[PDB]
Structure formats: structure tokens, C-alpha cells
Amino acid sequence: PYTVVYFPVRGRCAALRMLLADQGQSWKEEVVTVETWQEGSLKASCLYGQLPKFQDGDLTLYQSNTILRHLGRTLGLYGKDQQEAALVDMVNDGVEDLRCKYISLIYTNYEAGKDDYVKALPGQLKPFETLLSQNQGGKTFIVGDQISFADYNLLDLLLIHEVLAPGCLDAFPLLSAYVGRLSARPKLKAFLASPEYVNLPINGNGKQ
Amino acid sequence: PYTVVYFPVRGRCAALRMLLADQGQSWKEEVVTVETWQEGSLKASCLYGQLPKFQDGDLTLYQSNTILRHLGRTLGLYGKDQQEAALVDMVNDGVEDLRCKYISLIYTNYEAGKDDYVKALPGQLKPFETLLSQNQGGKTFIVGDQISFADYNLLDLLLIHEVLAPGCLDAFPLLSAYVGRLSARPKLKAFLASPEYVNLPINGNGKQ
Ligand SMILES: CC/C(=C\SC[C@H](NC(=O)CC[C@H](N)C(=O)O)C(=O)NCC(=O)O)C(=O)c1ccc(OCC(=O)O)c(Cl)c1Cl
Ligand SMILES: CC/C(=C\SC[C@H](NC(=O)CC[C@H](N)C(=O)O)C(=O)NCC(=O)O)C(=O)c1ccc(OCC(=O)O)c(Cl)c1Cl
DSSP, X not given: OEEEEEOSSOGGGHHHHHHHHHTTOOXXXXXXXXHHHTTSHHHHHSTTSOSOEXXXXXXXXXXXXXXXXXXXXHHTOSOSSHHHHHHHHHHHHHHXXXXXXXXXXXXXXXXXXXXXXXXXXXXXXXXXXXXXXXXXXXXXXXXXXXXXXXXXXXXXXXXXXXXHSTTTTTTOHHHHHHHHHHHHSHHHHHHHHSHHHHTSOSXXXXXX | OEEEEEOSSOGGGHHHHHHHHHTTOOEEEEEOOHHHHTTSHHHHHSTTSOSOEEEETTEXXXXXXXXXXXXXXXXXXXXXXXXXXXXXXXXXXXXXHHHHHHHHHHHHOHHHHHHXXXXXXXXXXXXXXXXXXXXGGGTSOSSSSSOOHHHHHHHHHHHHHHHHSTTTXXXXXXXXXXXXXXXXXXXXXXXXXXXXXXXXXXXXXXXX
């Protein structure tokens, strides 16, 4: 079945985990500790010397977005046609761009850059609110009327940002309702409330 | 047909341009100058306030990789099956990671970080050489036996790096032969030698 190999943090696996759970999929968690990593063995066997590492049968994958896309392709969470597929990518790419800045803050200069980051947030979130207003008034999903991997990724982005800047979604009604709505999905809700998710720090340096 | 809207630099459009050309596709180039951009009008109309912007009929896209994936999906440059598709993403994601570091150097600290960057290059390129050795001895493409958007993106990455660190491919025979082989493809060769490509600086700050 599936197996996600990662450190004991949500980080870049949070979204794909939400997806699997929400899709009623089963997966094995291979937890890697700082000690096991600093040993070098696993690091060397990784294509880009990094985790997450993913296994689907004998198919070994690396890169969180490759996992996301893979799951979306095989599970039918990639749009109804080529057009929607492109729109899904567009959203995911934007999520990725913002996640990189987030990651950079968290690990590069949390204390010095938090203010500037939070000041810039509105403008970084605005694109997703706009996307929402152009798709059935933000009533359904980020693209089309069926959920996609971009949704789970955007949801996570949103969630981690609420922790970073409590209330950053107040100025974005569609996003706020979107988070609540998605978070309310039965399987997802149960997952999000489970110790498996709740007891994992968002990041590995203790900053959030 | 297609229309790529960007600044007069190769940057994030180089790959997708190589693709179109190589695939015998026709496209219109909407050149945006620093003045036109600093006017703010076009910037505001862009989803993430950035270029490249792409048009395929009435489908407007943003994010270079979304364009790459879109073209790969519609032109059949995305693997022969879901498995290869995942592998293609995996390669592209790695290219993207390295391109971000490259971009960062070029615009953030070219003078101070060039040495450290060039010292780290071998390790950053190693993954692509390995990928190649696992696919028919690196005789065909980065994934499978048919070309994919990841190829054009990886090719560009390789090309810009040779300029950055002349000879960085000497330690990688498969990559070297790969670059030559791909660069030799008729339509691509003609494009690469054309003024349309040759007379465009790689980056917008004059550093390469
Ligand atoms: C969310 C931020 C985090 C990235 S995951 C860990 C990192 N892997 C990647 O960055 C993969 C990026 C790919 N493009 C992708 O999958 O999309 C990694 O493998 N780091 C280890 C290494 O040696 O490279 C991150 O930046 C980060 C940094 C440091 C730690 O560890 C601190 C600790 O717990 O002591 C973690 Cl856990 C993370 Cl997540
Ligand atoms: C190759 C590096 C380059 C990025 S493209 C220009 C930039 N757009 C993006 O970064 C989009 C990112 C998406 N994830 C993607 O398409 O992949 C952009 O629109 N910049 C303008 C803006 O105000 O946002 C880059 O970093 C860069 C930086 C500066 C300039 O201009 C200098 C000059 O000529 O005076 C350029 Cl042209 C570029 Cl390309």
C-alpha cells in the first residue's frame, strides 16, 4: 500500500497525510529520528538526500509535490479535464511558493522577519481568496466542483498560517469558510483531531 | 495558439520555449519591459503579481511549471503512464529546487556565494546523473524512452550551469552526453542557435 518516510513533524507531509486520510486510504508511517538521519545511510539512499520519501508498492518517490500529484492522479483528485488540471497545478505552485517563504522564515530568521512576513501575508493570501471567488463563489473547492490535491495543500498552508498569525484569515471570508468547511469533512475532522496529527509539532525547530 | 508574456530574458521561460520549438509549436511573444511592469497595471492583473503569464486560447496560466506541465499534458510529454508521470514530476521538482538556489545566487548574493555554490554543485547535479544511469544507461531521456517537459527543464538547468561554472558537467558523462544529444535535436538546435534565444540574456540583472 502506501508508506511515508519522514521525520516526526507535520511539515511537508501534513497535506498528503490529510489527503490519504480524507480519501479513506491506509498508510504506514516510517518515522526517522535526528540520530538515524545524522548517521548518513538513509540520507545517501535518497535521490536528493532529503525526505519525505514515499512508497507505493515498489514505486519509490521523493518530493512532497510529486507525492501529492501522484496521489491526485491515481485517486482522481486532479481536476475533471486538462484545463482544470492546469488550474490545479497553478494553485499548488502558488502554495509551494508561499510554503518556501514560510519555511525560510521558520528556519532562517523567525525573530527578525516575523513582523515583515506577517505584514506581507495579506497580499500572499489574496490570490487564493480571488481564485475562490471565481469558482462558484468559493462554495466548493479551489478548482472545479470536486476536491483536488491542491485543496489539501492549500488547506494545510492556511492552517499553519493561522498558528503563525492568528486571525490572518479574518480579512478573507471565502478562505475562512473554506478552512472550516474542509476541516469539517468527517474523515478529515477525525484525522485532524487524532493524536497522530495533533501530537506532532508543525515544524522540526519548535517554531510555528 | 500560444502566447508567452514575459520580460526580455530567458529565465523561467527558456525551458518551455525549448519545448514549443522542439515540438514544432508556434507561439507569440509578448515582451514586457521594466517600464511597463513598474507601471503596475499588468502586475495587478497577474494572479501572483508575477510573470511568466501564458495563454492557450482563452486559458490564462501563471507559474512556469504549470505551463510546463500543461504543455506536457496536452502534447504528450508527460510519461507513458502514471508511474512515469510521477517520475517526471520528481525530476522536475528537483530541477525546480536547484533553479531556486541558482536564482537566489544570481539575485541575492552572486559575489559572496558563488564559490560556495560552485563547490556544492557536484552534489546538486549528482541526482540527475544517477537518474540517467538507471534509465537505459542514460542513452535516451531523463525518464522512460520518450522526451518529457522535465527534459527541457533539466536541459536548461544544465545549460545555465555550464555558463555559471564552465565544465561542471565534466564529472558527469551521462549529463554531458545528454546535453549534447538533446541540443543536437534539429528543431531545438536551430532554436538554440537563433537570435530569438541567443540574443536574450539568461537573467535580468546581467549576472550568469
Ligand atoms: C517543511 C520544512 C522542512 C522540509 S522537510 C525536511 C527536509 N526535506 C526537504 O526540504 C524536502 C524538500 C523537497 N523539495 C520536497 O519534499 O518538497 C530534509 O530532508 N532535511 C534534512 C536534510 O539534511 O536535508 C525543513 O526545512 C526542515 C529542516 C530541519 C529539520 O530538522 C530539525 C530537527 O528536528 O532537529 C526538519 Cl525536521 C525540517 Cl522538516
Ligand atoms: C529566473 C528568476 C526570476 C523569476 S521570473 C520573474 C518574477 N516572476 C517569478 O519569480 C514567478 C515565479 C513563479 N513561481 C514561476 O513562474 O515559476 C517576476 O515577475 N518578477 C517581477 C516582480 O515584481 O515580481 C527573477 O527572480 C527576476 C528578478 C528580477 C528581474 O528584473 C531585473 C531587471 O531586468 O531590471 C527579472 Cl527580469 C527576473 Cl526574471
